[PDB]
Amino acid sequence: AHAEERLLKKLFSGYNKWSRPVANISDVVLVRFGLSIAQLIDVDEKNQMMTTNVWVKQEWHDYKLRWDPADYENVTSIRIPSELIWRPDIVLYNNADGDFAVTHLTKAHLFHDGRVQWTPPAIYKSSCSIDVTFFPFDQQNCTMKFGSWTYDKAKIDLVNMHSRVDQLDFWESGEWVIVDAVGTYNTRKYECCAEIYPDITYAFVIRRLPLFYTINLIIPCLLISCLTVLVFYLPSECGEKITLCISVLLSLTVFLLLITEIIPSTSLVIPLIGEYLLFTMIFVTLSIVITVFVLNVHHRSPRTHTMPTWVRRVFLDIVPRLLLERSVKEDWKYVAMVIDRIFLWMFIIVCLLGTVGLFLPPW
Amino acid sequence: AHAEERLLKKLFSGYNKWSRPVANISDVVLVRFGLSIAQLIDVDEKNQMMTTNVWVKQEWHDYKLRWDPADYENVTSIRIPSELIWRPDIVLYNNADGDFAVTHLTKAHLFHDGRVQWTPPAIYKSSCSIDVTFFPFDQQNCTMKFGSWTYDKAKIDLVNMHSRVDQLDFWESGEWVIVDAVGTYNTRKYECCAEIYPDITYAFVIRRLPLFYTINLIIPCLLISCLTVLVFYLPSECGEKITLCISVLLSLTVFLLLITEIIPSTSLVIPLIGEYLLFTMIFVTLSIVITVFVLNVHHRSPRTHTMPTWVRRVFLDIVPRLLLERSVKEDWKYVAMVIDRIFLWMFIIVCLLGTVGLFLPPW
Amino acid sequence: TDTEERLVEHLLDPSRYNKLIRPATNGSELVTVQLMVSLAQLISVHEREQIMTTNVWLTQEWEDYRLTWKPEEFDNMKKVRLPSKHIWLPDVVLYNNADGMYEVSFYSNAVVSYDGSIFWLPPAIYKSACKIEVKHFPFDQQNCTMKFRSWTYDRTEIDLVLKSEVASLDDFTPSGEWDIVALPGRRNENPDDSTYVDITYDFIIRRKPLFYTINLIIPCVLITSLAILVFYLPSDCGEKMTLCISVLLALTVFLLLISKIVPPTSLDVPLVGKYLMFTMVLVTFSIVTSVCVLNVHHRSPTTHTMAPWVKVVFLEKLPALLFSEDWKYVAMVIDRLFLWIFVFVCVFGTIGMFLQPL
Amino acid sequence: TDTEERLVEHLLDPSRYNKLIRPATNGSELVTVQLMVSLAQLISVHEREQIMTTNVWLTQEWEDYRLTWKPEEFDNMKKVRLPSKHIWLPDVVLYNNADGMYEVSFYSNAVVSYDGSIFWLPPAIYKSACKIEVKHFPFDQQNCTMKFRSWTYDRTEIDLVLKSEVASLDDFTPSGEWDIVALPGRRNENPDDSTYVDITYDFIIRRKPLFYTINLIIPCVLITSLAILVFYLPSDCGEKMTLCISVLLALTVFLLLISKIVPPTSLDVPLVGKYLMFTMVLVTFSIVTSVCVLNVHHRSPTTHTMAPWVKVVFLEKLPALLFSEDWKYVAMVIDRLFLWIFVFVCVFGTIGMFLQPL
Amino acid sequence: TDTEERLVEHLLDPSRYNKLIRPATNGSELVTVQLMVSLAQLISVHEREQIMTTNVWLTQEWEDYRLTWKPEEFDNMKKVRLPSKHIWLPDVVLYNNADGMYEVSFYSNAVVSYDGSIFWLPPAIYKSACKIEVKHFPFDQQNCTMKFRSWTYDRTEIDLVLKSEVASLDDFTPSGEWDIVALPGRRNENPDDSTYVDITYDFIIRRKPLFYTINLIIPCVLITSLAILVFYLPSDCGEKMTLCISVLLALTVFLLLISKIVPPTSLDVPLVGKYLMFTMVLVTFSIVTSVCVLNVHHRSPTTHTMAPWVKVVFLEKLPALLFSEDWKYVAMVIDRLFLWIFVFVCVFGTIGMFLQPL
């Protein structure tokens, strides 16, 4: 204990924190990287921002921080506050809405040979581009760029202690499951600057467990988007022909709108279900225009053209073609019924073609 | 001025900040409390949290900070940064989502006899239980526990400079008016620990000026809850009998729902207006079920039972009892009209009984 | 610069200077500080939260006998910059803080002249609280304040002076919702428990209404007209209910939308809301009469049809207004009776509404 | 006090004390620290955000040979308070942080006895993360944890001990949404890359359901009943559509309202939501049959009216159920057929729903 | 490294260096600083809040005679890194801050060459305020600025220079909503109370419209078409009201949705909103005529049916348009009259609308 203090005296007698600590001037520091994820918290899609809890395992060495354990009662690994020791400036290139790195500055171990091990915690707000297509079954590649800042490859080079990210103390609980977590070592010239500057880009591949949004988003809008064709079958004379249409269109727009306030509002790709709910709306609006065109001609018989070649097109030609006062009024009663069934065929045909176009990727 | 510096030299020549400063070991420090509220800001009911702006007038004494004013050109009260002087650890027991105390650490006066006056500002987030019943005419008792932490009654005892909280520099502007603000001196043993630890509990009694929520919440939902009975009077054959029902129920649920996102979601008491809007909904839903039961039997006459003892119950017995193809169909026309008026009597009777139960407290 | 290194050393070497102690020649004598405030931009006026967020440079001026020097003595230096934290400064601070940073936020260096005069202007952002008088929405003038005062010294050891009544708009980005109408500043003197000096700046800001004039007023004005129209529609459509319900809820929606923009205060009622509410009342009472009409309309068998009541409506009221089909008629008339009432009351009501702001 | 000034000086004068170094007599010997945790109040259980906010005093106890003294030597002092920042303390910290402050909030002074034993209890507010098991809403019991561990020392130089299994509810404001059911604490031991000690407190809290029982369950229970009622209504009103659409959207609204209260997890489905969803499915399939009924109803000219289909419905199904007017009849019957189906399925469904929690 | 320990000691040992004092050879002579700004990514363009959040490295360059050394003297060292906090640096800062951190975020080490030239580039995230010109939504080009200036020194003791007109996009993640169209930077000179130097960077960003082109424009374009369709529908359905109300509220909803995306400014009206509002006006005036039609339709007993008004509509307008059943006819015609008007006005209006952006 007294020895432990006296050890600190001798270490920090004349020790420079601001010195790049290697024996030779040319010789480099090897800094090793072990990324230990504590928990994945928020994956805010709309902001394209991921909030992670991370330990950044950093190992390096000082020839100046060596001692003889036998000289000091076999003390071999002393813990010393990081603030006093020289420390590499490991930072996040990819930070948004957060401090770049190492805010906490926790204590680090020193081994008697002068190697130093530092595993401080920190909260990082990574900014990854969010590809929304196959919502909600989507795989996202979210990266965290860890590099030095002021030191080039000549003076600092980074080493992967694992290619995989350490998940041993991970907080399993989330709406996500980690598909695989990958560490890539890269080097680059940055145009501002002269030298080559290395980095480690850590790519988290994450898959959304869809069962939540499957229930509360997809099932209802399928239940709702069913009723688009159903309007046609309803008889004109009930007076509810449009009341169903308006409900479908608006209810759809609510779900599209609700979805859009959850998507990142990017123009990279169209959110697949959004494109679906869009084309559904286009058909529904089209369905409303025709459904009003059905009712207009349907009711009135006095002072009506009722050209035969068109009533023959409808009653005599098309009626079997699709199957395979009262005199005029009921002529219209059927004519509307046929313009009806014709479009019911149209929509129920094209609907399935649209959904086949929706399932073309799994096909 | 030169004297003023030289005074500081002599004070802080050998002055210990970390010393509990009294002449005798047994003798205590008397710390005086004047609570000056600057403004009441947020009284977030949903979180049960009050945000206040406060000055904490703390007075005590040091035998070590005495001097002769005549010795130094009649300087008698010098202002010194609090950080250098010993300072009592006055803290809020009742804090939520905030620093416990004395973040700013502003300057304090020293009188030549050694007494020290400290009036630093700070923002406190008190956590008071919110009793929501008579919304919005509600009085809330919100408290702020100010006590020492490490020093027991033996070493620190607290004194009220006023029982009332100082409101002389208060920011009148709010939706609240202070009913009365009370300071209570208490002492207790805390179970962790051996000794007696005093506190001052400051109880703010606040009343909501209701005129806002009176307009935008209470008046419309009364205007809306009118229409519950009105459904019955509408004739069946208009076809709007349910369109009024659905609008009432949904409009009510919106107001209940809106109210609930404003209430603290506690299970202590039922929010009175919420319970009202609930029972209204129960009556309305009941009104929808019956008004559909009215329409079902009403229309059809072929192949109908039309048992006499029931049609005689309705047309011949009840019609005066409540007052004090066509042959069958119009029999039904009246029978529905009577099942109707019977329930209109039911609802308009019970409605007023419910509201009499609502106004039993002001009665 | 090399001489600057010397000059600074003399002035800040603590043997000469104790920051902790105010500089005045006599303890009798008081220090005067000059305070002028500069807008760089007015950022946010959150009405709901009753908060003004501004970014501000506040020019603080005073003199220290401790910090004088002869220019001849040190390479003819007229002026030197010094770190504010190391020299003494009057602890001038906002006393108007909502969630406040009481002092300035980033502590610029101070410009010091050879005669010992000090020029300081730190930037800060400030979150001032002002009562928001919401009546004539959105054409409303908000008098919003901010108190500056030394939180340490009273009117004994320090005194406060304005360099100008109006605040400086020198480097102001004009583009707000708001127009700066006037920006005066007053010096106040009153005794509390101890004597103190108040400097208060009044920001008088006029909202450019065009936005809420479009997307709030015009639609509810559009929908309020709908209210009276409901009657004209004949019972036999059935749609007398649909149109009547549609108007009410639209108005409540807009009332609630306004409610969550306006501050939740009970100081006064937003004129728009008061209007929107009173018409809402009129439509709810419209809704009950529309129902009353329909029950009069749709049944003739075993009906009273009391002659003196049919005469009053068909025979007496119809010409008074103009100057089972009879059952349909009495419905049409009891309708058009209330229509005449509503058209008068609505216009009389808006005339009463607009009488107040005029 | 004057002697306190002396005593403090001896103990903290760095020549005697190096805070940076743990005190144990032998490097062989380990320091043991006692940890007991006190609730002052449970503040928030944010289910959406999967976060417990509590305010907590954690009593930390250990002994330092460096900080002993003789009472006779210094005016019979038994106990002295010292600023925690200046003395050595085991860096005990939460390993359960969501957006976490890892260490405590106040850094209270530490009470030190003459034998060198230290008593520390700082206040903090803590934002613990726990997986929220949302099934039986709102009657749900959440086992929510919080790990305490020395983030610096391992099970070599420091060892951790409980003063109690149950956490202290000593000064607890009981008034939450939540009831404290049990509050045990365990000591865990496992080897990772290095050996470590875990102290874990389990907060088991039962939600008082009355609020959501009123303002969530009762309304959707009210509206779910409406679903079956839609059939009874005769086609000739026209209102078979209105009532049918109105029910569906109300249910989706409540489903979505629940969705944004529940955490967005896929661990399990909220029982209420599962029920609300399955009935929602039943009403959407109700909606299609209601339309199918109406097209059968409203047209007789040039209609199939195929006898074996009219016989099955009018002649065969009608007594089976009970025990152009014919067209209206077939509509009435194909209706009441599904009504019998829905009444059975609905009750069978709720019986199946409630079978699971029972 | 061991020699670095020596070199650093000489340069930072305060006897040689006073950070508090700027280095120039003569006080006459001015220090020039070179400023170039690098985008790493453009993060957020909050239109409502009128705020650009960017992360930025700003390359700061200048020279210190204090920090020279001979390489021969110290193991041929060309360049040494030093902690920025310990050396002097020009207090260069944003003057464009909304809720601003005025200085940078990391305080990186500075690269110093043997000749005394300093290379500094700290990372920061910046919350710049720019007026948002919202007209041609969503195809809008936003000129958003940020002022850099020394908040301490004026154009006397420090002068500012650009290393480039265009800002460096060197390590830029391209994936925004936004396209970088141009990125120039200007040097400005004007005298206020004191002479100052402004460096201003103009970010010109074009919104990729595809998102709002889909999920905002297309739906309201869909619903705006519905407006004219309302007439075609015959009175005898009853549904002339339903369809008419449904269109209005849908449009107001979309107007309000846009309103809370756009900044609440009155500088100008969003073209989309202006269009959505003017069509909204047209549908509200559609709503009243639809009612006027229905009362003309549904009653013939004791009706005026004044011949010169029946002749004008049945006999005169009908061929002009084409080139109690009569009562139904006059309804049909007074309808189709306004329909012809609305189709022309709508297309003429959209032609007038689209004429302006073209």
Ligand SMILES: *[C@@H]1O[C@H](CO)[C@@H](O)[C@H](O)[C@H]1NC(C)=O
């Ligand atoms: C993830 O993204 C990075 C760059 O963003 C890319 O280099 C890497 O290859 C990707 N990895 C996977 C598994 O997609």
Ligand SMILES: *[C@@H]1O[C@H](CO)[C@@H](O)[C@H](O)[C@H]1NC(C)=O
């Ligand atoms: C206020 O509340 C406290 C505790 O909630 C209670 O003990 C006290 O009696 C109350 N005081 C008044 C004036 O209501």
Ligand SMILES: *[C@@H]1O[C@H](CO)[C@@H](O)[C@H](O)[C@H]1NC(C)=O
């Ligand atoms: C503005 O505000 C203050 C306090 O509200 C008031 O005292 C002052 O008279 C007002 N002045 C003007 C010009 O409105």
Ligand SMILES: *[C@@H]1O[C@H](CO)[C@@H](O)[C@H](O)[C@H]1NC(C)=O
């Ligand atoms: C609480 O939580 C943990 C993990 O679920 C479990 O191991 C522990 O046994 C539980 N404690 C009790 C008392 O239920």
Ligand SMILES: *[C@@H]1O[C@H](CO)[C@@H](O)[C@H](O)[C@H]1NC(C)=O
């Ligand atoms: C950009 O912005 C400012 C102010 O909006 C303007 O003065 C400047 O000329 C603009 N620059 C360009 C290149 O458009």
Ligand SMILES: CN1CCC[C@H]1c1cccnc1
């Ligand atoms: C590696 N950093 C990121 C981009 C610039 C580069 C750099 C180079 C020298 C000093 N600091 C930073």
Ligand SMILES: CN1CCC[C@H]1c1cccnc1
């Ligand atoms: C007064 N505090 C509140 C509860 C514990 C007590 C206490 C006692 C000694 C040191 N710190 C705190």
Ligand code: NA
């Ligand atoms: Na509706």
